[PDB]
Design a protein around this ligand. Structure first.
Ligand SMILES: *[C@@H]1O[C@H](CO)[C@@H](O[C@@H]2O[C@H](CO)[C@@H](O[C@@H]3O[C@H](CO)[C@@H](O)[C@H](O)[C@@H]3O)[C@H](O)[C@H]2NC(C)=O)[C@H](O)[C@H]1NC(C)=O
Ligand SMILES: *[C@@H]1O[C@H](CO)[C@@H](O[C@@H]2O[C@H](CO)[C@@H](O[C@@H]3O[C@H](CO)[C@@H](O)[C@H](O)[C@@H]3O)[C@H](O)[C@H]2NC(C)=O)[C@H](O)[C@H]1NC(C)=O
Ligand SMILES: *[C@@H]1O[C@H](CO)[C@@H](O)[C@H](O)[C@H]1NC(C)=O
Ligand SMILES: *[C@@H]1O[C@H](CO)[C@@H](O)[C@H](O)[C@H]1NC(C)=O
Lengths: 879, 879
């Protein structure tokens, strides 16, 4: 009806979409299914069931399926977020997780795929050599035949990939026919199981590759001659005073049925682990046996490797790898964000059900001795799982070989395409050589490097030793795919909208943890190497990206970090659960371009205590075209002064035509979006009455208006010349906070930030509240904070100029009286706090009409008449 | 003469220096020396040497000492950097590595010190019980007496820590006397060795706690009665028809000299590992032997644990820990940055020499069988190392017990002080309860928690199992102390000035690697757990510091990341090796407060490709006091427009009275210090002639002058209404770049960036150079990027307005002619590039006199007359 393929889509298929069909079954399901059903299912799954016991085999398959399923969930989250590129799964992963994670996952998955191309060649060779056409001799035969087969497959994928695309369907057909034959055999093995008997010597199993009858003597022409097995346990071969070894004279050779019925109940026997070390004779704990020993013979089927749990998990994991292949044919899709998750998860569920069912079927149909037999021995040299089939084990032994060579072709096509895709991106520079492609867009150098790595793999001519490396590389790939999603969900990474119905970051984190444990349990010494290689690739990609975009390596690296943090900072809830003063210190520069108030910087350092954001802003009156030299000079001066006063922050100078306009620009333009200030710290205009320039107090009140309108807090320090330094300290003193009717939050939060510094550390705090929603919060804060409270109530007229403005707020959401009341405020404040070390004090807002600015400044001046060091505070915002 | 201490200094002594002697030997040498020399040296060093063979024992001691030595170099780099706080080593590490690393190292070293207070109690109990006053019985005796001893020691520390301070000198005396006795025994043993004999039956070793004579018979009154050992090997006790066991009737008891002379040369025997598993009889491969076996008696000294190299390194590592104690008396110093490094390194060299010497001496003095005896048996139940001593083994048996009790006191005093120091810093919230102090400044609840954890340790009553956990915690502490220095040196962390003569970050990195390998080799089980615990505490401290300073958890976390990156960015070389345009798009806001040119944003997106820094600035004409609502509305509008055009960057609005002054403030003040821009992107003032308000071209040229003065690049896009959108593309075209005389960097770099975007991907590049060293640079760039070059020379007067400017540069380090030559430039440019999709084109500088501004604009308008899309470019800077 229709032709399809299961291979990948590299840069060749991506450049088509950059220059400018199938559903879920044929688009995402069949590709993932044909790539998960590897060779292990046919060559090591029975052996794993045997040497692990159905219970532990089920646990191993479940853990592997658990990591791969959680990784499928994370990969579906990656697939749904944003547009799905036309390329393979690598392009999706890159565009979703950034170039760093994209390249790390790409290289780990590529090493995985190369060693998979090696394992599948080794498996096809093992099937061809051992089962179809017959110690270290076997390893060298596998080496030479696997090298020949790899040189053949490389030429095939190099010359004629189109035929591989055409025959992918035949390979899938072979896989499915083989699995259905396995199931049909398991079923037919209920009533009529097959006739595969095994010669077993007591409870020690014998081979059958050369024996014919499981009897100590055969009878040709009524002559009780000794069977051929006599020649393998007795160096007499005649029975004429035969000198047989220990174990043979005592015990019995028996024809044990090798495949009992599915309902026979043999499962009760092999429900437990064996884990016998190397060279141990395989023992069935069912038949009778003597106790004599010593007869170490050649026909005893021996455990071929020192099996263990952590070894079995690694040997089995490369049968669940391949889930990223689900979305390696994503360019030819109709609804990608719908077709990819469903297809991938359904494929993984299908394969997990097949594996978990076959574990139990092998448990309950194959004898507990034929399962631990890792080379199909003891059954006259036929495939273990092959014995469970409807027609004959031949269907399985041919289907497995064709499937495994097809998967080898698949992995020698997907690995170099992925390598040219990682090369053309210029993510990693030195791989640029592999960016070269053929005329039709097929990799050439990538294919050669993949051939080299696959040959390196093949030189270890044993599935049991290649499987851990393959599994570790795919495990690292899945670990990064599971960790990047968790990170981008937690840290609110931009453009991370995982439009999935079931993806919760806990799932990806759980997958990361599960098969991180899998990596380490398999082999921690391989796993640390893999983690360090992946981390080095990740950091090198990050460094190259920084050098590419910003122009410098480490400079640009910190630049990228800052820019990314600021971006991530924008797309969030602009409010904060707590308010913290992030200061803009307004330093006034005299006509000599020196800081007219260093105590401003000293007090800012004492307020912020070396932490937080401090923007020191200053305006230089003049024309910028002919002042930039003076600008750089004064900026260096202010930076040196900031360093001298232990202020950590940034300096901004604006060369402006008018001081008021310069400061009005500074108050609203300082800081990059996200790193905005929230308070403006000003010095009081000392001698405003004595400076006949009418613009001093005007400029001050203008700055106050601009701050209030911008909804920033304001901290006007007065008599700042008498503020302390950083080296000196106070023996004993009282920070008196005079919280007038409104704006309590700042007035109480500041003296604690101050007393938390070494200078003001040894002083006490006294809250002289004068004028009840806010009242409750003060008690809670003072409980948080264990300072001292005090209430001093007075007449309403004295605080009229305050309450008036306060009233103006509630409806929103004279001068002679102001002066006659400010003196009352003076009376109380001095009579209580005259000898304080720092008096915080709430402020009234500036008048609406700019005419009473002289009156407002006189109000302030008299309000502060007689106090040593005053911190006028104004809220302005929400807090 | 002078009284001193070896304990630590917690918040008690730090608050004193915050409120406001000994040199190197008595200040930082002896405290470290008394604290490195622990119990292992006397109770397990001999067994380790025996079990490992002198070679592998030397390897163990060397690897451990190298880990701790590189950690000492990193710790000295920490000590020299900045003023050294008066508190313990914890305060130094905190003030040098930030509260995150400070708390992580503090807690890991604290758990280390607690399990050390447990191990030393176990050791004192083992010495008291096994040697001084005599299976699971031993373990339960150790549990009971260790719990009793911990209950006593907790009271001792709680009541009378001053006496621990007073008798630290006696403890050090005991340590050094024990070591000197070891050396005196070793030297004396050459000519005169002591008479410690060992019974040995063939090559199987016998015990000696109950047996008296190494003979199968003794003769009282000349009667051949069989020795007591006959009863322990024969159930007859009379020799009358003795039914003696197998290995006893055959072989020969021999009284082998247990301590042969240092000149005897036994080292040839015990130069090789034994690693015999649990329960194996200890064999000397020198004496004669029969071959029968089976008679597993109770008097055969056995291997008490399945020992391995990875186990021996863990068992021995808690003998090199203690270098952080070197600076536990850092408040009482004269020259801290000079005393601490030299003191610590000299103490570590002393202890390393002591260990590497005792290894070889035990190799050459103790029999190769008495070494593998882990409980001092076979020598009449005497301490194996004690046998090497001049006066008697009892000097060691007493000195070691007193030293181990003293080290228990030291580690039960250093752990609660450290815990209260971590608590009072408010680094971790929940530990606040442990900040509770006694009257004189001593911990109360921290002591209880330390006692609880030490008891949890003592429940494991075996040094061989407490040592790996102690070693893992101290190894994690050293790994963090090594990694933090390497990081802060690489990344150029602010205030990281390691004024040390020999510290290089490669040393700290090799130390981190060595000690990480040690962790994982010892037990990856505990290594992963410790790494995860320390990482969680680190991230949690970072989160708490964020929520403390910025006010929010994740918001504040990203804020802190950005602030730290920006700060790190300041203390560096402000120039970068490569020039990359970081755009400031000057968007023009109409009277409707709507962007008059979205194409500016589209083109900035195409130019930067969504990566890099893009600050979109705009001025609102008016007063800020009464426009803030309109300001926020237009800012939201511009943000929506930027997000619509895929522009990743920030937005800044300034409400100013004069558009020209607003722009002159934007250009020089945008961005936080470090994240400055270096290119200003403008839209051409279309219809400047048709506007009777001459302020259009005046403002444009003012902006150009400001950009030139600020030394920023300038990109004026003309006919921007024709610039393509994001969704469309160019099928084919040519970016014709006209590098006239100057600024080849930008003119060759911009079209490469543009062709790198999908819109301009399918177009080619043509350089129509018009006017030697600069031509060289062009060749290299074109070789790097593979674009097309071409040269079109013309007359000098035609480029007068350019070369004139050029002349002004050389000395640094008319209108009718310019116009009539501009039309010639027009003829060339149109004849070559009329149909070009985008003509880049160099700019002349604006006239020095502001009168020719109309003439300058007419010159530009002519120069650009007839072209579809022009990008006027001006370098301005260094590049
Ligand atoms: C297959 O047959 C062989 C030969 O009989 C089995 O080896 C023998 O198994 C018996 C089991 O009872 C072992 O006896 C054991 O001896 C130890 C030592 O005294 C005793 O503590 C136990 O209680 C038990 O009686 C016998 O030692 C062993 N022969 C050896 C090890 O040489 C083998 O176990 C059989 N396999 C299975 C799976 O049953
Ligand atoms: C202490 O004495 C015992 C008793 O003689 C030693 O056990 C025996 O050691 C000999 C060493 O020559 C072993 O001989 C070896 O036998 C194996 C297997 O037959 C053979 O392949 C070797 O080439 C060698 O001839 C003998 O098996 C062993 N007896 C056992 C294991 O039951 C023991 O080695 C002595 N210990 C030391 C440290 O010398
Ligand atoms: C071997 O078989 C014979 C007869 O079938 C039986 O008598 C004998 O007990 C068997 N041997 C064992 C060890 O079961
Ligand atoms: C035990 O000692 C006797 C007497 O010296 C000697 O003849 C015999 O060979 C020794 N046996 C062994 C096994 O060395």
């Amino acid at each position: 009806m229709a032709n399809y393929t299961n291979l990948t889509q590299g840069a060749k298929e991506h450049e088509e979409a950059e220059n400018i069909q199938m559903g879920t079954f044929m688009g995402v399901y069949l590709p993932c299914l044909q790539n998960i059903f590897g060779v292990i299912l046919f060559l090591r799954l029975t052996w794993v069931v045997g040497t692990a016991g159905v219970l532990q085999a089920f646990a191993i398959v479940l853990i592997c399926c658990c990591c791969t399923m959680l990784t499928a969930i994370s990969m579906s989250a990656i697939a749904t977020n944003g547009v799905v590129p036309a390329g393979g799964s690598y392009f999706m992963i890159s565009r979703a997780l950034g170039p760093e994670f994209g390249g790390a996952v790409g290289l780990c998955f590529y090493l995985g795929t190369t060693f998979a191309a090696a394992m599948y060649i080794l498996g096809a060779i093992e099937i061809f050599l051992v089962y179809i056409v017959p110690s270290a001799a076997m390893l060298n035969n596998m080496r030479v035949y696997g090298t020949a087969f790899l040189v053949l497959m490389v030429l095939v994928v190099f010359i004629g990939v189109r035929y591989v695309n055409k025959f992918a369907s035949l390979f899938l057909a072979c896989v499915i026919v083989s699995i259905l034959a396995i199931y049909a055999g398991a079923i037919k093995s209920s009533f009529a199981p097959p006739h595969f008997p095994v010669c077993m010597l007591g409870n020690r199993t014998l081979s059958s590759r050369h024996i014919d009858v499981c009897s100590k003597t055969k009878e040709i022409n009524n002559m009780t001659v000794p069977s051929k097995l006599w020649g393998f346990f007795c160096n007499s071969s005649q029975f004429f005073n035969a000198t047989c070894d220990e174990y043979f004279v005592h015990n019995n050779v028996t024809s044990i049925q090798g495949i009992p019925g599915l309902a026979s109940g043999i499962i009760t026997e092999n429900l437990w682990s064996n884990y016998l070390p190397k060279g141990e004779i395989i023992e069935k704990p069912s038949a009778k046996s003597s106790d004599v020993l010593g007869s170490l013979n050649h026909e005893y089927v021996l455990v071929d490797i020192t099996t263990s749990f952590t070894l079995l998990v690694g040997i089995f994991f490369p049968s669940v790898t391949g889930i990223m292949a689900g979305s390696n044919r994503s360019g030819d899709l109709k609804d990608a964000q719908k077709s990819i998750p469903i297809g991938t998860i359904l494929a993984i569920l299908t394969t997990s059900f097949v594996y978990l069912s076959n574990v139990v079927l092998f448990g309950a149909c194959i004898e507990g001795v034929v399962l631990r037999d890792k080379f199909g021995d003891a059954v006259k040299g036929n495939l273990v799982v092959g014995t469970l089939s409807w027609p004959s084990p031949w269907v399985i032994v041919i289907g497995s070989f064709f499937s495994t060579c097809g998967a080898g072709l698949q992995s020698l096509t997907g690995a170099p395409r992925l390598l040219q895709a990682i090369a053309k991106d210029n993510i990693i520079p030195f791989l640029r050589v592999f960016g070269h492609s053929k005329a039709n867009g097929e990799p050439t150098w990538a294919l050669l490097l993949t051939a080299a790595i696959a040959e390196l793999g093949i030189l270890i001519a044993s599935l049991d030793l290649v499987a851990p490396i393959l599994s570790m590389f795919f495990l690292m790939c899945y670990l990064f795919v599971n960790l990047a999603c968790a990170l981008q969900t937690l840290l609110r990474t931009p453009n991370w909208r995982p439009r999935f119905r079931y993806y919760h970051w806990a799932l990806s984190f759980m997958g990361m943890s599960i098969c991180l444990a899998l990596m380490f349990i398999s082999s921690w010494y391989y796993a640390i190497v893999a983690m360090v290689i992946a981390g080095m690739i990740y950091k090198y990609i990050e460094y190259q990206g920084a050098e590419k975009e910003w122009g410098d390596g480490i400079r640009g690296l910190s630049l990228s970090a800052a820019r990314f943090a600021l971006l991530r900072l924008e797309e969030g809830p602009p409010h904060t659960k707590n308010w913290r003063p992030q200061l803009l210190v307004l330093l006034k520069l005299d006509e000599d371009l020196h800081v007219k108030h260093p105590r401003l910087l000293t007090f800012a350092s004492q307020l912020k205590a070396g932490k937080g954001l401090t923007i020191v802003g200053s305006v230089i009156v003049g024309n910028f075209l002919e002042n930039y030299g003076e600008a750089l000079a004064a900026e260096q001066t202010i930076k040196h002064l900031m360093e001298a006063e232990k202020v950590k922050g940034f300096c901004q100078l604006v060369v402006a035509a008018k001081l008021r306009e310069g400061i009005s620009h500074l108050i609203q333009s300082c800081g990059l979006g996200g790193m905005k200030h929230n308070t403006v710290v000003m010095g009081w205009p000392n001698g405003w009455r004595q400076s006949e320039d009418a613009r001093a107090w005007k400029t001050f009140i203008g700055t106050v208006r601009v701050t209030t309108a911008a909804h920033l807090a304001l901290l006007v320090a007065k008599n700042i010349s008498f503020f302390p330094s950083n080296v000196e300290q106070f023996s004993e003193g009282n920070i008196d906070v005079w919280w007038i009717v409104h704006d309590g939050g700042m007035l109480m939060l500041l003296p604690f930030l101050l007393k938390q510094h070494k200078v003001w550390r040894k002083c006490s705090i006294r809250i002289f509240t004068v004028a009840m929603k806010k009242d409750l919060a003060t008690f809670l804060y003072h409980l948080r904070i264990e300072a001292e409270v005090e209430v001093v109530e007075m007449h309403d007229s004295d605080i009229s100029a305050y309450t008036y403005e306060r009233d103006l707020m509630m409806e929103q959401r004279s001068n002679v009286r102001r002066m006659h009341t400010a003196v009352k405020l003076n009376e109380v404040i001095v009579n209580k706090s005259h000898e304080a070390k720092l008096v915080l004090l709430n402020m009234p807002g500036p008048p609406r009409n700019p005419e009473g600015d002289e009156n407002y400044m006189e109000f302030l001046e008299v309000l502060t008449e007689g106090l040593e060091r005053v911190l006028l505070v104004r809220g302005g915002g929400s807090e």
